[PDB]
Amino acid sequence: GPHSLSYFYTAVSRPDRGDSRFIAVGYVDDTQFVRFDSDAPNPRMEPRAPWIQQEGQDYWDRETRKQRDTSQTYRVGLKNLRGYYNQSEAGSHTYQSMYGCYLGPDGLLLRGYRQYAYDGADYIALNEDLRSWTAADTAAQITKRKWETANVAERRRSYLQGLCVESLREYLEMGKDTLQRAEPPKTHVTRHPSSDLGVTLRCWALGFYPKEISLTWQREGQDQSQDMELVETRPSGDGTFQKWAALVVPPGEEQSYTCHVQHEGLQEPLTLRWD
């Protein structure tokens, strides 16, 4: 598919303790592989997928150096943002950034992104040309000027076109047995009682990777998405994902409906019924 490396930073101001906490998670595609928690004693970058543990001590040392630096950068950020918005030190506020690189089929950067948010709302974002910024309000224009003055745009662009894609490609080889294996959903359909003139069919897709999947019900080949319940895709706990789709059918009419699954690790789209 179009593979990606992404990081997610959450900085949270903590009034009672008079400090803040910075948490970072790194992903490759749908797979978490590193974490950093400014609360941990002697905080370090830490493995969260087995295949990243083959990185030697220099990788862990230098990733730790950055996260410790950026952790304190974001602590200053939280106080500046408090000033910009005429906010007291009574409440806790959240300051997030996410950034990453998508890999195109030519080994080249498909799309790079870097954005920031404050208390849940978009604050400033790197434009798609990786050369300019878009600020959301008055406060973010202060930040935009500072980053224009200091030429931050092409530091992000360089990372995003260089080290981001380069490490992504190492990670993809290091963990090719898992990252580059498309695992198929194990599927089955169950029946349960509902209401008056109602019987629910629930079509399960279990233990699949990656996260993207398509589940649909059909009566005589026409989509039933108006009257169907589709749960958000959820993690299994072992690195795989789970999802189901249920609908209410008239009692005795079950065989007229089918469940349709497309997943990247499936030869053909699968069609299954109630058995």
Partner: peptide, 9 residues
């Protein structure tokens, strides 16, 4: 590998 983030908001 993470980007180096230096400049303040």
């Amino acid at each position: 590998a993470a980007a180096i983030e230096e400049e303040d908001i």
